[PDB]
Design a protein around this ligand. Structure first.
Ligand SMILES: Nc1ncnc2c1ncn2[C@@H]1O[C@H](COP(=O)(O)O)[C@@H](O)[C@H]1O
Ligand SMILES: Nc1ncnc2c1ncn2[C@@H]1O[C@H](COP(=O)(O)O)[C@@H](O)[C@H]1O
Ligand code: MOO
Ligand code: MOO
Ligand SMILES: [Mg+2]
Ligand SMILES: [Mg+2]
Lengths: 423, 423
């Protein structure tokens, strides 16, 4: 019972539930989705503020020479002083406008007159300004009680700046899921192994997945290598489910071998929604939901053992699940359209997620700017070098035809689009 | 002496030098740029490995019933057993191929014959296979001594997987720069302040920059609020320069006020390359290089105080500097072309970095897929709400003309393109 990827994703989305919100500190809120609206407790600026370094004037006075009656840069500077017609006040950018002044003339349109500090301060205003010029009225950037951030908004640097503006240092957010990761196989040895014994390989999926989960900003619970023994894998899965994690990722032990126990163990512990997906690479992907005994849900992905299939299934299915649990309203990956830089043979049986290195060009080959893709070469699921530098997965339909250079395909972007190397 | 942004970026790039490489552990290498090539010490697979769960056969035998002479899943399974013509061996995916077998027939093309474990094991091979089918020969994924990663390559999840495959757990990389951050101003109060006194605002730039630097994966040295006092700012800058940081970010104290000491202090401590940039927002941006006394270079950015200008200058100038110091060969931000969803008035004096929310659409308005942009509204440099959710900066030339909806502009992508919300 092999299901299409679109259905497998819908099933995963339907089962995945946003985590309960928590309260975190300002810097812990970075990267998280807001679980409450944020309202400004005071206006910005809270006082009428100068846009410029210069002089606060009565605009109707016009060009002329005037005494400087106060200097206003911050705090109580100029408190109680009224700028009346025929006077001016020195101001710096962000300085409070003294009462009575209704415009600011930038310092470049003024000239200091008389002996610097050996006579009372006088300045020549060189222009005719207009009422309100270069003054930020109270609340013109942010009004008191305005909503500056809303529930469901992801917190980036400017949102941290808005929380700080509003004096919020404890924030209600959706947390990231905690993810347990294990590898399976009698053939595996730790990546610290030197000379390999006959029939041994280094466990590469576990470190790869730990890294992938770290890129998604989740806490990792590293459960190590598990051997192809049903009782042993049951014990580790039972320990993982009762530990408080939200997602368990296993790799391997999910194909057709007589010692592949992931599927029967997930069927016994919880509910397996699927164990076969019509995709290349990634056919053995298994997804299950387990209820931890009181009491919460744990999502389990029995990822394929083949290194490419493992990472592709992580990118397509686990990344949107992490985002959904973390409260993202748009957990789907970015899909763009792009032109192939070389010919690519699609698979005749399953739609292929072909690894590519994509870049934006001024000419994508059709005379207009656009993304272009180069294949990473041989796409065998055992060839982790096919994932090297791959920032996208080309979605090739199961036609079996050769897609020529210059033809357009849909591509899933799997790595930070703002970290893309330019053409 | 106001210089174009293109020149200001060239000056910064010319002064910025990659940091000395360091040795880090496997998981610390994630996100860093490799400073050495990585070669596979053994092949992958190191033994001829089955692609399938099934039976290792002599392909020339063809369809028929055969005794199963061994079972090979991992390690020393089947060591010393030779599959001769007229025999087969059970194998699981990744299991070593016994000597003498030259093809694998997947279990779906076989049938077990006789009483399960109450008679010696026999299997019917249902197809005529071909020599080499479903076997991974030694080194077919990675050859012994092949270079699997090269100097200058950024380490993502698949690169961590390749390091683990190759048994590398200590990696030579370029480190991230350490960044000191301070705010300036007599008007500032901490973001924990409740009711604000007259002429006070909360310091929002510092937390915003700490967050921005944390998104760039750099260590932050938070030097707090500094008042508009030359001796005090000199002391903090001198302490920052001798602390071992690589970059200092200040904000404010760089306009035309009589208590703006950042520029004269940077001129005194080191070499100021520029202090005026032809851009909107961000005109007061100052850049300097200071030599810390023995002995290393410290880059200083006197960022503008206006919150928008501060973050825009961070995105345009500081992000590529961090990347250059961290050894990125492509530190420039991603620039794409896109269509405007609404009309935008460009500035008549300076090229504007207009904040936008961009998304990829199936129809960008011209009948072909592409990025589209919505303005974040009023672009005043004091209005941090104009940065809210902005994932790009539209590069508008200094024409002063109204760019109509549907016209195309260049846009700098400033936030993870793989975290873009879909249309
Ligand atoms: N942690 C791992 N690291 C590298 N390769 C793996 C890992 N787990 C399984 N494999 C390989 O992936 C393939 C499928 O594994 P399995 O699903 O257990 O049969 C076999 O060739 C395994 O040797
Ligand atoms: N850390 C900060 N947070 C928020 N606003 C700031 C900060 N530093 C300076 N400003 C404002 O930015 C503008 C320019 O500051 P300056 O360059 O010091 O004149 C003034 O309106 C300041 O009040
Ligand atoms: O069975 Mo796969 O789709 O090569 O991991
Ligand atoms: O002087 Mo600006 O360019 O509004 O920070
Ligand atoms: Mg296995
Ligand atoms: Mg200031």
């Amino acid at each position: 019972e092999m299901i299409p990827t679109e259905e497998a994703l819908r099933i995963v989305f339907g089962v995945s539930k946003r985590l309960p919100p928590v309260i975190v500190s300002l810097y812990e809120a970075l990267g998280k989705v807001l679980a409450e609206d944020i309202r400004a407790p005071d206006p910005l600026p809270p006082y009428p503020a100068s846009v410029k370094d210069g002089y606060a004037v009565v605009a109707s006075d016009g060009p002329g020479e005037y005494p400087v009656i106060t200097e206003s840069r911050a705090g109580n500077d100029g408190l109680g002083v009224t700028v009346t017609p025929g006077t001016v006040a020195y101001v710096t950018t962000g300085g409070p406008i003294p009462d009575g002044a209704d415009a600011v003339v930038q310092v470049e349109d003024t000239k200091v007159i008389g002996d610097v500090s050996t006579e009372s301060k006088r300045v020549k205003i060189l222009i005719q300004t207009k009422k309100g010029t270069d003054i930020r009225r109270v609340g013109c950037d942010i009004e008191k009680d305005a909503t500056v951030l809303t529930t469901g908004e992801r917190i980036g640097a400017s949102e941290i700046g808005l929380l700080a503006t509003a004096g919020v240092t404890m924030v209600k957010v959706y947390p990231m899921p905690i993810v347990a990761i294990l590898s399976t196989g009698d053939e595996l040895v730790e990546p610290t192994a030197g000379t390999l014994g006959r029939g041994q390989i280094r466990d590469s999926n576990r470190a790869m997945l730990v890294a992938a989960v770290m890129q998604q900003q989740c806490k990792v619970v590293d459960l190590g290598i598990v051997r192809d023994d049903r009782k042993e894998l049951e014990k580790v899965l039972d320990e993982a489910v009762s530990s408080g994690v939200d997602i368990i990722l296993t790799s391997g032990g999910v194909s057709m071998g007589d010692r592949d126990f992931v599927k029967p163990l997930l069927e016994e512990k919880g509910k397996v929604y699927f164990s076969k997906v019509l995709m290349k690479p990634g056919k053995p992907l298994t997804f299950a939901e387990i209820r931890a005994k009181p009491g919460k849900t744990v999502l389990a992905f029995g990822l394929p053992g083949n290194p490419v299939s493992c990472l592709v299934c992580f990118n397509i299915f686990v990344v949107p699940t992490i985002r959904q649990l973390a409260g993202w309203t748009s957990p789907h990956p970015l899909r763009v359209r792009l032109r192939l830089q070389e010919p690519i043979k699609s698979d005749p049986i399953a739609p292929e997620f072909h690894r590519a290195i994509i870049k934006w060009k001024d000419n994508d080959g059709s005379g207009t700017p656009g993304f272009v893709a180069e294949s990473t070469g041989h796409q065998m699921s055992s060839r982790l070098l096919s994932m090297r530098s791959a920032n996208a997965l080309l979605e090739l339909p199961a036609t079996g035809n050769v897609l020529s250079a210059g033809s357009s395909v849909s591509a899933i972007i799997v790595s930070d689009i703002s970290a893309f190397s330019i053409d």
